[PDB]
Design an enzyme around this catalytic site. Structure first.
Site, PDB file in Angstrom:
ATOM      1  N   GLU A 157       0.701  -1.236  -0.201  1.00 38.08           N
ATOM      2  CA  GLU A 157       0.045   0.061   0.170  1.00 38.08           C
ATOM      3  C   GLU A 157       0.884   1.331  -0.064  1.00 38.08           C
ATOM      4  O   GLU A 157       0.633   2.090  -0.912  1.00 38.08           O
ATOM      5  CB  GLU A 157      -1.071   0.080   1.222  1.00 38.08           C
ATOM      6  CG  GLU A 157      -2.091  -1.025   0.953  1.00 38.08           C
ATOM      7  CD  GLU A 157      -3.090  -0.540   0.041  1.00 38.08           C
ATOM      8  OE1 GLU A 157      -3.126   0.445  -0.657  1.00 38.08           O
ATOM      9  OE2 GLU A 157      -4.022  -1.579  -0.175  1.00 38.08           O
ATOM     10  N   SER A 217     -11.852  10.562  -4.020  1.00 36.56           N
ATOM     11  CA  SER A 217     -11.268  10.440  -2.881  1.00 36.56           C
ATOM     12  C   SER A 217      -9.807  10.060  -2.974  1.00 36.56           C
ATOM     13  O   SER A 217      -9.090  10.241  -4.063  1.00 36.56           O
ATOM     14  CB  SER A 217     -11.716   9.133  -2.088  1.00 36.56           C
ATOM     15  OG  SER A 217     -11.428   7.982  -3.101  1.00 36.56           O
ATOM     16  N   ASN A 252      -7.684   8.883  -5.903  1.00 35.27           N
ATOM     17  CA  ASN A 252      -8.456   7.948  -6.729  1.00 35.27           C
ATOM     18  C   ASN A 252      -9.330   8.638  -7.551  1.00 35.27           C
ATOM     19  O   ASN A 252      -9.720   9.851  -7.758  1.00 35.27           O
ATOM     20  CB  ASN A 252      -9.506   6.994  -5.625  1.00 35.27           C
ATOM     21  CG  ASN A 252      -8.595   6.006  -4.758  1.00 35.27           C
ATOM     22  OD1 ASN A 252      -7.541   6.603  -4.330  1.00 35.27           O
ATOM     23  ND2 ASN A 252      -9.029   5.160  -4.243  1.00 35.27           N
ATOM     24  N   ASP A 305     -12.532   8.264  -8.026  1.00 35.34           N
ATOM     25  CA  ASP A 305     -13.803   8.971  -7.675  1.00 35.34           C
ATOM     26  C   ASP A 305     -13.699  10.247  -6.831  1.00 35.34           C
ATOM     27  O   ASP A 305     -14.754  10.959  -6.365  1.00 35.34           O
ATOM     28  CB  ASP A 305     -14.629   7.962  -6.719  1.00 35.34           C
ATOM     29  CG  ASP A 305     -14.008   7.711  -5.594  1.00 35.34           C
ATOM     30  OD1 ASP A 305     -12.985   8.218  -5.219  1.00 35.34           O
ATOM     31  OD2 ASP A 305     -14.380   6.846  -4.449  1.00 35.34           O
ATOM     32  N   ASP A 308      -6.404   8.174  -0.711  1.00 33.18           N
ATOM     33  CA  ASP A 308      -5.963   7.283   0.207  1.00 33.18           C
ATOM     34  C   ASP A 308      -4.771   7.765   1.010  1.00 33.18           C
ATOM     35  O   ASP A 308      -3.855   8.413   0.547  1.00 33.18           O
ATOM     36  CB  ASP A 308      -5.454   5.858  -0.249  1.00 33.18           C
ATOM     37  CG  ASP A 308      -6.521   5.266  -1.255  1.00 33.18           C
ATOM     38  OD1 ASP A 308      -7.563   5.247  -0.900  1.00 33.18           O
ATOM     39  OD2 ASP A 308      -6.230   4.689  -2.023  1.00 33.18           O
ATOM     40  N   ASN A 317      -8.943   5.423   2.772  1.00 31.84           N
ATOM     41  CA  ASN A 317      -9.623   6.414   1.702  1.00 31.84           C
ATOM     42  C   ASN A 317     -10.346   7.291   2.526  1.00 31.84           C
ATOM     43  O   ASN A 317     -11.288   7.096   3.620  1.00 31.84           O
ATOM     44  CB  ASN A 317     -10.369   5.477   1.097  1.00 31.84           C
ATOM     45  CG  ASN A 317     -11.071   6.039   0.003  1.00 31.84           C
ATOM     46  OD1 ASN A 317     -12.371   6.497  -0.340  1.00 31.84           O
ATOM     47  ND2 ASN A 317     -10.267   6.172  -1.384  1.00 31.84           N
TER      48      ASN A 317
END
Ligand code: CL
Ligand code: CL
Ligand code: CL
Length: 129
Positions: A35, A50, A46, A48, A52, A59
């Site tokens: 990650e 959002s 991301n 959409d 991380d 998120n």
């Protein structure tokens, strides 16, 4: 902070992640490796809208508030910046909620694709834990 491998294992163990929800410590170390490469300051946008954050790439749509994410729920009740600290407490507390949400560690797509089913104990080899 960029954690060493065994350094992160010891911190994760101290904070109660070894075998949390039945996931051994190596699963958590493996997830963090893929990650964030063990970097608490990692951030990644991301599609959409959002983002991380942190060692476990948590998120901002569901879990933390960053002030710019459509549909934000802030279920961990934490600013996303708290997930970038050198102290992993906030990331661990939130990860415990995520892994309890119903799909286990499949919530971390990189865990599913790179850790699940592999010899995850390798990630804690050599550590004094
Ligand atoms: Cl393990
Ligand atoms: Cl820590
Ligand atoms: Cl599970």
């Amino acid at each position: 902070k960029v954690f060493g491998r065994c350094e992160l294992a010891a911190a994760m163990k101290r904070h109660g992640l070894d075998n949390y929800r039945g996931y051994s410590l190596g699963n958590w170390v493996c997830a963090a490796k893929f990650e964030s490469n063990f970097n608490t300051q990692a951030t990644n946008r991301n599609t959409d809208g959002s983002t991380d954050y942190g060692i476990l790439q948590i998120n901002s749509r569901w879990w933390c508030n960053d002030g710019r994410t459509p549909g934000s729920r802030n279920l961990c009740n934490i600013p996303c910046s708290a997930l970038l600290s050198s102290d992993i407490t906030a990331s661990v507390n939130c990860a415990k909620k995520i892994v309890s949400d119903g799909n286990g560690m499949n919530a971390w797509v990189a865990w599913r694709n790179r850790c699940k089913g592999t010899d995850v104990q390798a990630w804690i080899r050599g550590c004094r834990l």
